[PDB]
């Protein structure tokens, strides 16, 4: 019943190959719903989920103005940060921003988020009070001072507690048939001898939404954390996700192993075994 909205901004310089590319994508939970790319033939905000298509031209135009202006601002920001780190104009650099709001199961604001990174490292983040900043280094302190002087945190807070929550609630309603539907994992266990005396048991979860899931192996009821090979949860391309966990076991001990699956969509947690 808990939900979040996030926008993810990536601004990437590329000296000798034009001005920095700016992309923005928006998500509700694990569902992308919009994109903007300054490298598109005709840059404009585009729908990426069916439930957003109902928004009118004013919406799309508003978004497009925001992202076009951000495109220019982030180019200035990239110039600024190159100088804060005394970097040459030769290299390519990236600013990333992810921000948004989390709602609890009652649709109330749980907390806001607004974090930025430079070249893949924490740079500056708005604290949970939505009023103060945490700067990673002396370069980010320059940004912090500039944002404190301009009372930027106040602007972020007003958005995070206002429009962010309002529109997230709107999207959740408009896309309720999918956004508020948890699809449980379809599961099974496979068995593959690796030699005369060992075999691989692999526990599968497929077709689940949202991506959050817990998949573990136990032996005689004990967690096999170190012995379990766990792949990263991965998108199927139909909105759903997949994951597996594997353990190599002594031939003949298969029945001592149990796979445990926790997921929002599940009536109740599953325990599964290999079934020859």
């Amino acid at each position: 019943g808990s939900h979040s909205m996030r926008y993810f901004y990536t601004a990437m310089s590329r000296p000798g190959r034009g001005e920095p590319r700016f992309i923005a994508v928006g998500y509700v939970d694990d569902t992308q719903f919009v994109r903007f790319d300054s490298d598109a033939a005709s840059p404009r905000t585009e729908p990426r989920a069916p439930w957003i298509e109902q928004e009118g031209p004013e919406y799309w135009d508003r978004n497009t103005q925001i992202f076009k202006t951000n495109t220019q601002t982030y180019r200035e920001s990239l110039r600024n940060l190159r100088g804060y780190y005394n970097q040459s104009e030769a290299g390519s650099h990236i600013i990333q921003r992810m921000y948004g709001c989390d709602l609890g199961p009652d649709g109330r604001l749980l907390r806001g988020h607004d974090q930025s990174a430079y070249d893949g490292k924490d740079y500056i983040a708005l604290n949970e009070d939505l009023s103060s900043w945490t700067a990673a280094d002396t370069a980010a302190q320059i940004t912090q001072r500039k944002w404190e002087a301009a009372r930027v945190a106040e602007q972020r807070r007003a958005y995070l507690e206002g429009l962010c929550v309002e529109w997230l609630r709107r999207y959740l309603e408009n896309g309720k048939e999918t956004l508020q539907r948890a699809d449980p994992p379809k599961t099974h266990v496979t068995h593959h001898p690796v030699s005369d005396h060992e075999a691989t048991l692999r526990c599968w979860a497929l077709g689940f939404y949202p991506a959050e899931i817990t998949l573990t192996w136990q032996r005689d009821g004990e967690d096999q954390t170190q012995d379990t090979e766990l792949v990263e949860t991965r998108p199927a391309g139909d909105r759903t996700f997949q994951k597996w966990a594997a353990v190599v076991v002594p031939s003949g001990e298969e029945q001592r192993y149990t796979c445990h699956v926790q997921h929002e969509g599940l009536p109740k947690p599953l325990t599964l075994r290999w079934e020859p």
């Binding site: 926008y7 923005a24 928006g26 919406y59 508003r62 978004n63 103005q65 925001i66 992202f67 202006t69 951000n70 601002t73 982030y74 200035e76 920001s77 600024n80 940060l81 600013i95 921000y99 930025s116 740079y123 500056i124 940004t143 500039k146 944002w147 301009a150 930027v152 602007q155 972020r156 958005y159 429009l163 962010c164 309002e166 529109w167």
Partner: peptide, 13 residues
């Protein structure tokens, strides 16, 4: 909806 533009110039990093 993303964060809107402020009344004046947005503040760069």
């Amino acid at each position: 909806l993303p964060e809107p533009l402020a009344q004046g110039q947005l503040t760069a990093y």
